[PDB]
A paper describes a structure:
The thin filament consists of [name], tropomyosin (Tm), and troponin (Tn) in 7:1:1 stoichiometry, and Tn is composed of three subunits: [name] (TnC), the Ca2+-binding regulatory subunit; [name] (TnI), the inhibitory subunit; and [name] (TnT), the Tm-binding subunit. Tm is a long α-helical coiled-coil protein that binds over seven [name] subunits on one of the two long-pitch helical strand of [name] filament and forms head-to-tail connections with adjacent Tm molecules to produce a continuous helical strand along [name] filament. Upon Ca2+ release from the SR, however, Ca2+ binding to TnC causes conformational changes of Tn and a shift in the azimuthal position of Tm on [name] filament to allow [name]–myosin interactions. Here we have determined the structure of the entire thin filament from human [name] in the absence and presence of Ca2+ by fully utilizing the recent technical advances in cryoEM and image analysis.
We also carried out cryoEM structural analysis of the thin filament in the Ca2+ bound state, obtained a 3D reconstruction at 4.8 Å resolution, built an atomic model and compared it with that of the Ca2+ free state. The overall structures of the entire Tn complexes in a pair are similar to those of the Ca2+ free state, showing the same conformational difference between the pair in the TnTN linker region connecting the Tn core and the long N-terminal α-helix of TnTN, except that the density of the C-terminal region of TnI above the Tn core is missing in the Ca2+ bound state. The Tn core in the Ca2+ bound state shows a marked change in the orientation by its counter clockwise rotation of about 30° in the horizontal plain with a slight swing up of its distal tip of the IT arm, the major part of Tn core formed by an N-terminal region of TnI (residues 41–136) and a C-terminal region of TnT (residues 199–272). Even around and within the Tn core, TnCN and the short N-terminal α-helix of TnT changes its position and orientation relative to the rest of the Tn core. Most of all, the Tn core shows a large change in its position and orientation together with the azimuthal shift of Tm relative to [name] filament, forming more intimate interactions with [name] subunits. As expected from previous observations revealed by EM structural analysis using the helical symmetry of [name] filament, the position of the long coiled coil of Tm is shifted azimuthally along the surface of [name] filament by about 10 Å. The azimuthal shift around the head-to-tail junction is markedly smaller than the other part near and above the Tn core where the shift distance is close to what has been shown in the previous studies by EM helical image analysis of various types of the thin filaments. This is likely due to TnTN binding to Tm in this region and its N-terminal side also binding to [name] filament, restraining the Tm shift.
Numbering used by the authors:
A (entry chain Q), B (entry chain P): 11 to 65
The structure:
């Protein structure tokens, strides 16, 4: 207990460092997902440009 | 005190829970970078199908 505030604070720093790494990945992956979505839509809208040009 | 460890632990435990959540977000986003990349390529493959059908 007595040193657990410290062990848990350091654990929290590490757990936060890891939730942060996971969260930073979430943000980076969020940026990539969005980039892929913009590119997907680039290609989906393009899919329609060709589909429409095709019909 | 037990309360200092409990609070630091709540920070650590919640940070671990947040790591789970952050990891869930980042692993889901990675799965969705795959779904977006896959769907991007779904659309890219289809762009060629329409582009080719178009040409």
């Amino acid at each position: 207990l007595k040193l657990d505030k410290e062990n848990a604070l350091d654990r929290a720093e590490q757990a936060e460092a890891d939730k942060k790494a996971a969260e930073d990945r979430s943000k980076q992956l969020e940026d990539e997902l969005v980039s892929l979505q913009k590119k997907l839509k680039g290609t989906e809208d393009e899919l329609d440009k060709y589909s429409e040009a095709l019909k």
